[PDB]
Amino acid sequence: FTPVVLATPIPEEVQQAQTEIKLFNKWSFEEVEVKDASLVDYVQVRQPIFVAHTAGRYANKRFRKAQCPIIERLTNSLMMNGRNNGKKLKAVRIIKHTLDIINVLTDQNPIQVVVDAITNTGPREDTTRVGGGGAARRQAVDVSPLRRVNQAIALLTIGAREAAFRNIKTIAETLAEELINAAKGSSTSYAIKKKDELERVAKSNR
Amino acid sequence: SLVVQEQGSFQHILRLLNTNVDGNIKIVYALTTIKGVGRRYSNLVCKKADVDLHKRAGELTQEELERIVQIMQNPTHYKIPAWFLNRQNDITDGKDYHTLANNVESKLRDDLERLKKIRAHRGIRHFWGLRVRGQHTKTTGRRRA
Amino acid sequence: GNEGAIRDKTAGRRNNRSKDVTDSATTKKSNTRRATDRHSRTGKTDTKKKVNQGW
Amino acid sequence: PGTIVLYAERVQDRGLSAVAQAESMKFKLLNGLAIRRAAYGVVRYVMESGAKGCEVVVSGKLRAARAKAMKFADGFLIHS
Amino acid sequence: GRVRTKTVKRASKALIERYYPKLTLDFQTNKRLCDEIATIQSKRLRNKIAGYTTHLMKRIQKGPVRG
Amino acid sequence: AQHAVILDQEKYDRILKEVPTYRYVSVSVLVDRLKIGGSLARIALRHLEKEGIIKPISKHSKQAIYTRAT
Amino acid sequence: VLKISTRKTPNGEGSKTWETYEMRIHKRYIDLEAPVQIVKRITQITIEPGVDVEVVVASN
Amino acid sequence: TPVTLAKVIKVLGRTGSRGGVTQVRVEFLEDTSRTIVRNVKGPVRENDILVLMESEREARRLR
Amino acid sequence: PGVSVRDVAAQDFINAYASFLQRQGKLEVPGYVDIVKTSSGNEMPPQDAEGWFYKRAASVARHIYMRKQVGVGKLNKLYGGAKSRGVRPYKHIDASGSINRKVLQALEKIGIVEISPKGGRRISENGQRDLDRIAAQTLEEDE
Amino acid sequence: AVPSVQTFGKKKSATAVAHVKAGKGLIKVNGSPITLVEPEILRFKVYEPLLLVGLDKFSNIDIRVRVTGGGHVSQVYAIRQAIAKGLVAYHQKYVDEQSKNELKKAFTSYDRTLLIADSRRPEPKKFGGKGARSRFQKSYR
RNA sequence: UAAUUGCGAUAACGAACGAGACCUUAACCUACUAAAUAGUGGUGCUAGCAUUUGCUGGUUAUCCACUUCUUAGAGGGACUAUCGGUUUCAAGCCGAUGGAAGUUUGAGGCAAUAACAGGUCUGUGAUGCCCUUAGACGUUCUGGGCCGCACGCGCGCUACACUGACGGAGCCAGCGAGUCUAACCUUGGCCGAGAGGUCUUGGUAAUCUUGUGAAACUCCGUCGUGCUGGGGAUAGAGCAUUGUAAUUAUUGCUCUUCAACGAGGAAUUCCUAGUAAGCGCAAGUCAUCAGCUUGCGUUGAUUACGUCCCUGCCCUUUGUACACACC
Numbered sequence A: 001f002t003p004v005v006l007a008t009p010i011p012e013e014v015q016q017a018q019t020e021i022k023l024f025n026k027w028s029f030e031e032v033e034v035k036d037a038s039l040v041d042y043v044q045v046r047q048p049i050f051v052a053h054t055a056g057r058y059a060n061k062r063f064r065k066a067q068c069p070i071i072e073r074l075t076n077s078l079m080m081n082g083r084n085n086g087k088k089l090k091a092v093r094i095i096k097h098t099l100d101i102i103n104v105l106t107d108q109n110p111i112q113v114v115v116d117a118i119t120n121t122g123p124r125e126d127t128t129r130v131g132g133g134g135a136a137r138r139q140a141v142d143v144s145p146l147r148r149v150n151q152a153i154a155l156l157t158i159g160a161r162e163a164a165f166r167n168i169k170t171i172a173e174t175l176a177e178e179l180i181n182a183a184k185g186s187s188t189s190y191a192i193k194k195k196d197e198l199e200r201v202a203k204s205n206r
Numbered sequence B: 001s002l003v004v005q006e007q008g009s010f011q012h013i014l015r016l017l018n019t020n021v022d023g024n025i026k027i028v029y030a031l032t033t034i035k036g037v038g039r040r041y042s043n044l045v046c047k048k049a050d051v052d053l054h055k056r057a058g059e060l061t062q063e064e065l066e067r068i069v070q071i072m073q074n075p076t077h078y079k080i081p082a083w084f085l086n087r088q089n090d091i092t093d094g095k096d097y098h099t100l101a102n103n104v105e106s107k108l109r110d111d112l113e114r115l116k117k118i119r120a121h122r123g124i125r126h127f128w129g130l131r132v133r134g135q136h137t138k139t140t141g142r143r144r145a
Numbered sequence C: 001g002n003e004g005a006i007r008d009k010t011a012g013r014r015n016n017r018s019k020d021v022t023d024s025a026t027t028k029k030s031n032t033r034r035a036t037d038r039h040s041r042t043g044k045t046d047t048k049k050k051v052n053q054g055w
Numbered sequence D: 001p002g003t004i005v006l007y008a009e010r011v012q013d014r015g016l017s018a019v020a021q022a023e024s025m026k027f028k029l030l031n032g033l034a035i036r037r038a039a040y041g042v043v044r045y046v047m048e049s050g051a052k053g054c055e056v057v058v059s060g061k062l063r064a065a066r067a068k069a070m071k072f073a074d075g076f077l078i079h080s
Numbered sequence E: 001g002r003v004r005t006k007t008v009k010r011a012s013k014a015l016i017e018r019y020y021p022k023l024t025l026d027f028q029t030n031k032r033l034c035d036e037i038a039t040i041q042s043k044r045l046r047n048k049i050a051g052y053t054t055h056l057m058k059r060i061q062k063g064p065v066r067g
Numbered sequence F: 001a002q003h004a005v006i007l008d009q010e011k012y013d014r015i016l017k018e019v020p021t022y023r024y025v026s027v028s029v030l031v032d033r034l035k036i037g038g039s040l041a042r043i044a045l046r047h048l049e050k051e052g053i054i055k056p057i058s059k060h061s062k063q064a065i066y067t068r069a070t
Numbered sequence G: 001v002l003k004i005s006t007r008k009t010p011n012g013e014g015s016k017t018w019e020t021y022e023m024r025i026h027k028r029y030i031d032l033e034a035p036v037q038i039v040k041r042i043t044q045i046t047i048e049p050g051v052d053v054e055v056v057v058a059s060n
Numbered sequence H: 001t002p003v004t005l006a007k008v009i010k011v012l013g014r015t016g017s018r019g020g021v022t023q024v025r026v027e028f029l030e031d032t033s034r035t036i037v038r039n040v041k042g043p044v045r046e047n048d049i050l051v052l053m054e055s056e057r058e059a060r061r062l063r
Numbered sequence I: 001p002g003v004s005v006r007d008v009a010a011q012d013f014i015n016a017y018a019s020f021l022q023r024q025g026k027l028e029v030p031g032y033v034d035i036v037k038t039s040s041g042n043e044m045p046p047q048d049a050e051g052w053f054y055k056r057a058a059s060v061a062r063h064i065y066m067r068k069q070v071g072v073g074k075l076n077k078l079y080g081g082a083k084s085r086g087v088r089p090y091k092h093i094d095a096s097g098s099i100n101r102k103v104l105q106a107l108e109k110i111g112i113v114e115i116s117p118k119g120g121r122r123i124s125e126n127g128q129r130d131l132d133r134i135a136a137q138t139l140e141e142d143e
Numbered sequence J: 001a002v003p004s005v006q007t008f009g010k011k012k013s014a015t016a017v018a019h020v021k022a023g024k025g026l027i028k029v030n031g032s033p034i035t036l037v038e039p040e041i042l043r044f045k046v047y048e049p050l051l052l053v054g055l056d057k058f059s060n061i062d063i064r065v066r067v068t069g070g071g072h073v074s075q076v077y078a079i080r081q082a083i084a085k086g087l088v089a090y091h092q093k094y095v096d097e098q099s100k101n102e103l104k105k106a107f108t109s110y111d112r113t114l115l116i117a118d119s120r121r122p123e124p125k126k127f128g129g130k131g132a133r134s135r136f137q138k139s140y141r
Numbered sequence K: 001u002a003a004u005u006g007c008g009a010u011a012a013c014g015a016a017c018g019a020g021a022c023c024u025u026a027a028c029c030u031a032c033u034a035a036a037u038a039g040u041g042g043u044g045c046u047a048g049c050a051u052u053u054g055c056u057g058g059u060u061a062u063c064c065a066c067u068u069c070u071u072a073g074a075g076g077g078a079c080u081a082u083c084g085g086u087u088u089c090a091a092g093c094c095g096a097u098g099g100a101a102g103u104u105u106g107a108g109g110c111a112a113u114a115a116c117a118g119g120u121c122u123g124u125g126a127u128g129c130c131c132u133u134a135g136a137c138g139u140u141c142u143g144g145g146c147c148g149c150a151c152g153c154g155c156g157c158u159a160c161a162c163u164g165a166c167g168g169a170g171c172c173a174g175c176g177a178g179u180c181u182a183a184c185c186u187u188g189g190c191c192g193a194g195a196g197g198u199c200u201u202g203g204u205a206a207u208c209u210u211g212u213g214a215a216a217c218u219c220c221g222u223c224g225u226g227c228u229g230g231g232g233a234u235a236g237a238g239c240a241u242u243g244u245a246a247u248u249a250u251u252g253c254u255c256u257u258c259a260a261c262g263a264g265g266a267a268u269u270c271c272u273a274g275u276a277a278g279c280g281c282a283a284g285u286c287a288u289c290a291g292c293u294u295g296c297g298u299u300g301a302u303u304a305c306g307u308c309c310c311u312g313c314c315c316u317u318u319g320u321a322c323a324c325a326c327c
C-alpha cells in the first residue's frame, strides 16, 4: 500500500487504509447496499466518511437532509432529551461502540445491518385523522420515502433510549440489540412492533 | 487489583454499634448507614486503621473493627482535625465531640429543648414545628406537616 | 412574651392544619370596575361652546 | 476665574431649529392666542423660513376637562 | 421572497427608456454605468436598480414588454 | 445488594467455563447471568486477559467488548 | 462599546420591553519625532469641538 | 405478500384538513403507463418511489 | 531521535510521571493529604489516597513547563470545577489554595520549578533537564 | 528565508493560523504533534485532509498551527480548513497550477467546510426570553 | 410578495408618508493605508532531549523585515447572479452550478394615520384640583414590618440517575467591567482543610487583573441497580466574610442529619439552523446578597419547508334604528 513516513510519526494503522478502499473507522463503506427498492436515493452511503461528525447545513433547503450520511443522521438522533441536547461527542462515541458490536456476533459489516435495520422499520402504510364530521375514522395513508427512514431512525432510538433507562446495560448495547432485531425485524425490536401496529390499523380503514 | 476469592471469611450480615450492615456492599460505603457518620467521616478513619477499602464488608477480619470504632469514639486522641466533626465546643464544656447514632437523636433534642427552655425565638419556631432558618413560609412546605 | 408564645396554645402547624381554609382563599380577581370604564362616571359633560373657545 | 467664559451667538434662521419654534408657541399660547391661530402661525412661518416640512402637536386640556390633541403639519415629512 | 420595490422598478424603466445604445446585457457593466449616469444614494440600491435593468434589457432581446 | 455481588467461591468455577460460546461480553453481560455485581465484575474482565481468554476488540472505559479466545 | 440596557416604561406595566443604548469611544495614539518649539504649534489649530487631545512624554 | 411498484410521475397538491397530506399520481414500474393517484404522509418530491399494500384502491381528497 | 513533552499523550504521560515520582521517594507531602477534598466545589477527596499527589504533581509540572510562568491562583482555577450547590445552579469555583501552593514548594525543594521573576513560578532548568527523559521512558511503551 | 506561506481556518469563533515552511514534513499544532490532539473520536476529522489528497505530499513542507478562541470542537474544525487552504496556497506560489487545481478539486469533491469557511454564526438573543428565538413561558391568567 | 410588494386587469393617469430605501451589528478581502498597548518570520542573547544539521521553550525591546492572523480606517462585494424548471411563460417562484454570503443575506434599529378613560401624580423642583400642615400625611431619629402561614394560583431553580453521580486527569470561549482625592479590578509569595487571612505589585486599561485554563464536554478509574454513592429539602454543632447592626438564622466553608422525589392527571408554554435544548460567563442590581434579568460565547439535534382544522387577527361583502358607535 506504498507507505510514506516523515518527521511527525504517522502510525501504520492510519497509514494502511487512507487511499485504500475507503472504510469507516474500522468498516468497509463499499459492499453496503440498500436491500429495499424504495429508500434508494434516500440512504446516503457511497459517498463514505470515516467518522460521523460533519458540520454541514442540511436544513437551509428542504431535501438537503436526504444527501446527508445516513449513519450520521442516526447518531445525532441520540443526543436528545435535553439531557443529551448537544453532547454529539458522547453520542458519536456510543455509535463507534455500537457498531463495534453486533459485528461481534453478526459477521456482516455494521453499516450494512444498519441499513437493513431501517429498511424493515418504515411504516409503508399508516393512518390519519380524517375530518369526517365529528367522530372521524382514520384514512389509509402511505408514508413518504424519507419520512419512512426518518420515522425508522426515530423509532429505533426511542426504543433503545427507553431500554437503557434504569438498567445496567449500556445505551450502546440496547441500540446494538435493537438493530440486530431490526436488521430483519423479528418480534422484539420496539421499532418493528410500533411500525406494524401503525400499519395494521392502516387496514382498519378500507 | 486482581480477582480474589476467600473461603468463608465473608459474612453477609453482622451488627455493631447498635446498627446493621450489608456485607455485600463496600465497607467505605456500608459503614455510612449509621447516624452521625458520613461518606467523608468514614473515608478518613478507614485508612487511618490501615485497612484497604477496595473489598466489601464481610471482609475486614474483626481485629481491625474492634478498634475501628475506638478511633471514632476517640477521634481527637487518634489524629483527626477538630473542624471535621459535628459537635465542637459542645454547648457547656468547650470540648469537641462526635456524636454517632444514638446520642445524635438525643443530642438533637438536647440543644432543641435547650433553646426552648431558654425561650429563644428559634426554640419557639421548633416548638411550633416550622422552619427555623428564616426561609419564607407562605408559599413553601405545605402538606408534609 | 416569649414564654407566652410557647405556653399559649392555639399556635403551631398542628393547631392550624386541624382547621379548614376559608373558602375566600380560593377566590378570584373581583374585576375592578372594568366593564364601566368607557362610561364617564363624573356625571358632568363639557359644553360645546366652551371647547370651541379652547380649541 | 478665567478657566471659562461664554459668548452669545445669535442662531441663524431660528425657524428651522425646532427648539426655537417650540418655545415660540409656549410663549404664544401663554399670551392668550387661539390654539389654532398660534399653532398655524409657527407652521406657516417655519415653512416660509426654509424648512422642507413641519409639524406640531398640542396635547393636554384647553378649558375642556377631557384632554384633546391636534396636529398641524405642512409640506414633506419622512418618518422611517 | 424579494420582489423589487417599484422605486427601483420605476427607475429601471425610466433609464431603458433613454439609454438603450448603452446599457449592455451585463450587470457589472450596467452597475458602473449608474454611478456615472444616475444619482443613486447607495450601492445596494443601485445594485438592484442595475440588476433589474439587466433583466428587463435581457427580455427586450426576446420581445416587447409593458413600459 | 442482591444476587452474589462478591467473590462467591463456587461461582468462581462458573465463570471459568462460561467464557466460551460467548460472541459478546461486557460488564453488563456478566451480571446478566444470575451473577456478580458490576463492581467486582469490572476488574475481573481483564483478569481473564492475563492468559488467552478474550479478544479485546474494545477500546476504553464505560464500554468493553472482548471476544472468544482465538 | 458602552451599552445601557434598560426597560422603556418608567413604571413596570405592559410587556417587559427592554432597550439597549450605545455610546462608542475612539482613542488614537501617535508617537512623534518633533522639536521643542512645535510643542505648542500643533496644540491650538489641532482641535474640532468634541476630540479630547492628550500629549505624552518619554517612556519612563 | 403482494407488493406494488409505484413511482410518482407528478404531484397534485396538499389535500387534507391540516394540510399534512397530498394527492399524488404515480406510475407502476411494473406494467408502466399506469395510474393511480394515491396519497402520502411524509414530505415528497418528484421521481420518488413507494410501496402500496392494496393497489386495487384509491381515495380522493380527504375531508 | 529527540523527543519532547509535547510529543507524548497527556494522560499516559503524567500517569507515568506518577509511578516514577511515586516510586522515587523525595516527596515532602505536607502530611495532611488524608482528608482534603482538593476544593470546596468537590464532594469527596480523591480515590487513590496513597498517591494522587504524585498524579497531581505529575500535571502540576507538565503545565508549568509548557508556559512561561504560573501562580498558585491559576492552578486553583484550572482544576477547580463546577460545584453542585444542592438545589441551586452549578457554578465554577477555584480549587484548594494550599494543596497547590505547597505542591510546588514540595517540588521546588526537589528542584523542578523555580520562583520565576515577574511573579509566578517557571519550570526549573534541571526540571527542564528531565523533560524528555520521562517523555522518552513513556515512548518505550510502544517501542 | 525559504519558500513559505501563511493561511487560516475559521470556525464559529475559533481562528486557526497555519504557517507552511519548506521542510521535511513536520506537523505540530501549537507545538504538539498532530498524532494526538485530544478529541480522540474527532481525531480523524483533521487526519482526512492528508488521506484525501494522497497522503504523502509533504516531503518538502512543514506545517504548524496555533488556535486562539473557540471551543473543544470549534478549533478542531478550523485547523483542518486552515491546513487544506494552506497546502493549496503553497501550490499556488511554488508549484504549477494543475497540481493545485487537482488538489482543490479533490477537496471540494468531499469538502465539509474544508476550504469555504462555514458562514454560520451565533444569533443574538432578544429580550423576552433566555434564548435566540426561544421565549419565556406564558401564563394566560 | 414579509409588505397598498409588484405583475396583470383597469376611468383613471402619474406621486408622497408608512413598507422598501435607510442605519447598526455578525459574516468576505494575502488589494490600500501599519501598529512594543496587536501579531508573524529571521536573528542575536538563551534552555532541554537527541544528535547529523533537528524538535520544544525562555528572552518589556538585542536587532532586522513584514501585516496572514489581531485591530479599524478607506474602498470593493450581491444584484437572488448564471443556466435551467414553473408561470398570463408577466411579477414572481423553484432546482442545479458558482459563490464569504443567495430564508427582507442572518440579527436587530427606526417606523405613518388613528385608536385606550391601558399603566405611570410611588422617577421627575413635570403638573390641575382636593386633602393635610406643628399632637404634621412635612422631616429626621430608635425599633418593628414589607419575609409574617391551615391554603389557592404563577415565573423559576435542583432532581428522580448508568447518554449517570463521583474521583483523578485532559482542558477551550465570548459579550463586559474596573481606584482621585482613592479604597475599584487584583496577579504574585507565604499561613490556613476550607472559607479565608496576610505581604506586595500592575492597571484610569487592547498596556495590569486575564489565554478570564468558565461550564457542560473529552479521557481513566471506583461504584452496580437496590431511593443506591441518584437526590439534596430540613436540621444540629463549628469556623469565616459583608457591615454601625446578621436574632426571624445576609453570603461563604466544614462535619453531621439524608425528606419528597422511581418521568408527573386534566390541562398548557417556547420554538425551524448554529435555531431548539443542554452549558457555564459577563453585565445590570450590589457594602453583603441571583434560583432574576440583559448580553455572550461554549456543545449542538429532532422534525417542518405545509395547511385554515383549532385558536387569534386582519380583509372584502352585508345588515344596522349604533356615531358617547354593542361598555
Ligand SMILES: [Mg+2]
Residues within 6 Å of the ligand: B032, B033, B034, B035, B036, B037, B038
Ligand atoms: Mg448518614
Ligand SMILES: [Mg+2]
Residues within 6 Å of the ligand: none
Ligand atoms: Mg456625482
Ligand SMILES: [Mg+2]
Residues within 6 Å of the ligand: I077, I078, I079, I080, I081
Ligand atoms: Mg476546569
Ligand SMILES: [Mg+2]
Residues within 6 Å of the ligand: I078, I079, I080, I081
Ligand atoms: Mg478538573
Ligand SMILES: [Mg+2]
Residues within 6 Å of the ligand: I084, I085, I086, I087, I088, I089, I090, K158
Ligand atoms: Mg445541584
Ligand SMILES: [Mg+2]
Residues within 6 Å of the ligand: none
Ligand atoms: Mg442557566
Ligand SMILES: [Mg+2]
Residues within 6 Å of the ligand: K067
Ligand atoms: Mg489585514
Ligand SMILES: [Mg+2]
Residues within 6 Å of the ligand: none
Ligand atoms: Mg452550492
Ligand SMILES: [Mg+2]
Residues within 6 Å of the ligand: C037
Ligand atoms: Mg382605569
Ligand SMILES: [Mg+2]
Residues within 6 Å of the ligand: K120
Ligand atoms: Mg408621571
Ligand SMILES: [Mg+2]
Residues within 6 Å of the ligand: none
Ligand atoms: Mg426608621
Ligand SMILES: [Mg+2]
Residues within 6 Å of the ligand: none
Ligand atoms: Mg415584595
Ligand SMILES: [Mg+2]
Residues within 6 Å of the ligand: J136, J137, K155
Ligand atoms: Mg414572565
Ligand SMILES: [Mg+2]
Residues within 6 Å of the ligand: none
Ligand atoms: Mg467527571
Ligand SMILES: [Mg+2]
Residues within 6 Å of the ligand: K192
Ligand atoms: Mg486551621
Ligand SMILES: [Mg+2]
Residues within 6 Å of the ligand: none
Ligand atoms: Mg500605582
